[PDB]
């Protein structure tokens, strides 16, 4: 069925599963035409397909050529997403195929179910969590590979870098969702927090900076503060009056 707060731990069990987010598949800029009308220009997008236990990210780059000459692009994008996730599953050895695919948006359910009819034993599920995977395009190295692509392309990343050598996947997913939520709420400030310190760098084969455990605790704190700060700026709330119980709920409530 649906995935929510009652079954958080199921994401980090040994049943292979993937999250599929389609929010960056069909991307456009809206602009005025010479005649004063409005038109869209597509730009490259990506499917965000993630194993939350391992960090493996199957990033299918959606080149703008896939939209050429097509109608009803927002509808097509859901089916294109489903087609590509299906092709990925079929490309994987049987013992690597997922037992469950969790879609972040319920509009993906029927497209993916239909494309996966050949896999009756793979469960297609929605989720009540509001996961911030849209902010993936705020990770500089992901945004770069998407915008530079001149053709359809699949790129593989581990979105946890080497974190799993030191922390569990429940903690790694918590860190990733906190980072993505912050980048989604205030991207400039989140990148400022992450990159303000020259002495901490991003390894060539990593997405995030090489923080020590203690620095990650500092970074995570600065991200919660950013989420709380924006929360107050948004609703005109004096954050100083807020209690720790109120804060957990505000930050936890965002996802």
Partner 1 sequence: MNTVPFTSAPIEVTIGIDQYSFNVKENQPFHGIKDIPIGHVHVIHFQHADNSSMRYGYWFDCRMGNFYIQYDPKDGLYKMMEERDGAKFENIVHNFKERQMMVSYPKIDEDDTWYNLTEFVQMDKIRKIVRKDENQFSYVDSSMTTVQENELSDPAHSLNYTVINFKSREAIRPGHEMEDFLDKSYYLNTVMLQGIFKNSSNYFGELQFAFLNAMFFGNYGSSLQWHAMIELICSSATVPKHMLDKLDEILYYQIKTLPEQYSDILLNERVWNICLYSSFQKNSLHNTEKIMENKYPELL
Provide Rg for the chain, Cα atoms. Answer: 19
Q: How many residues does the chain have?
A: 255
For the segment 106-145, give every residue that binds ligand WCB (CB under 6 A): 129
For 35, which DSSP code?
T
Q: Which does residue 110 bind out of partner 1, ligand WCB, none, counting CB within 5 to 8 angstroms by kind? A: partner 1
CB-based contacts of 47: which residues, under 8 Å, 6+ apart? 20, 21, 22, 24, 25, 58, 59, 60, 62, 81, 84, 85
- 158 phi and psi angles, rounded to 5 deg: -105, 110
Residue 115's binding partner among partner 1, ligand WCB, none (Cβ under 5 to 8 angstroms by kind) is partner 1
114 binds partner 1 (CB under 8 A): yes
**Nearest distance in Å: CB 75, partner 1:** 8
216 binding partner (options partner 1, ligand WCB, none; Cβ < 5 to 8 Å by kind): none
x/- map, 77-96, partner 1, by CB under 8 A: --x--xx-------------
Beta partners for 125?
Answer: 102
Angle between helix axes 244-254 and 169-185 (nearest 10 degrees) is: 90
Paired residues of 106 in beta bridges: none
Q: How far apart are CA 136 and CA 133, in angstroms?
A: 5
Choose the stretch contacting partner 1; rule: CB under 8 A; options: 3-11, 111-119, 125-133, 167-175.
111-119
Kindly state whether residue 173 participates in binding ligand WCB, applying the rule CB under 6 A.
yes
Residues numbered 9-68 forming contacts with ligand WCB, rule: CB under 6 A: 11
Contact between 76 and partner 1 per CB under 8 A: yes
Task: Answer yes or no whether residue 181 interacts with ligand WCB by CB under 6 A.
Answer: yes
Structure tokens at 173: 């997913």
Residue 130 or 203 with smaller CB distance to ligand WCB: 130
d(CA 34, CA 36): 5
Give contact residues for partner 1 (rule: CB under 8 A). Answer: 76, 79, 82-83, 110-111, 113-115, 117-118
Summarize as ranges the residues that interact with ligand WCB (CB under 6 A): 8, 11, 129, 170, 173-174, 177-178, 181, 251-252, 254-255
């Amino acid at each position: 069925g649906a995935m929510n707060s009652s079954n958080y731990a199921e994401l980090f069990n040994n049943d292979i599963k993937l999250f599929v987010d389609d929010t960056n598949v069909y991307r456009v800029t809206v602009h005025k035409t010479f005649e004063g009308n409005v038109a869209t220009k597509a730009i490259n997008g990506c499917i965000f397909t993630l194993n939350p236990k391992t960090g493996h990210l199957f990033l299918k780059i959606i080149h703008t050529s896939v939209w050429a000459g097509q109608k009803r692009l927002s509808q097509l994008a859901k089916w294109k997403t489903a087609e590509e996730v299906s092709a990925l599953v079929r490309s994987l050895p049987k013992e690597e195929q997922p037992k469950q695919i969790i879609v972040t948006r319920k509009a993906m359910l029927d497209p993916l179910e239909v494309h996966m009819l050949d896999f009756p034993n793979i469960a297609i599920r929605p989720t009540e969590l509001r996961l911030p995977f849209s902010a993936a395009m705020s990770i500089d190295k992901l945004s770069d590979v998407v915008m530079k692509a001149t053709e359809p392309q699949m790129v593989l990343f581990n979105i946890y870098d080497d974190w799993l050598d030191r922390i569990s996947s429940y903690t790694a997913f918590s860190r990733l969702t906190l980072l993505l939520r912050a980048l989604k709420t205030n991207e400039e400030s989140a990148k400022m927090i992450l990159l303000s310190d020259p002495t901490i760098t991003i390894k060539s084969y990593h997405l995030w900076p090489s923080f020590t455990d203690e620095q990650w605790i500092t970074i995570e704190s600065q991200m919660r503060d950013l989420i709380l700060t924006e929360y107050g700026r948004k609703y005109n709330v004096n954050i100083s009056a807020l209690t720790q119980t109120e804060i957990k709920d505000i930050i936890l409530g965002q996802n």
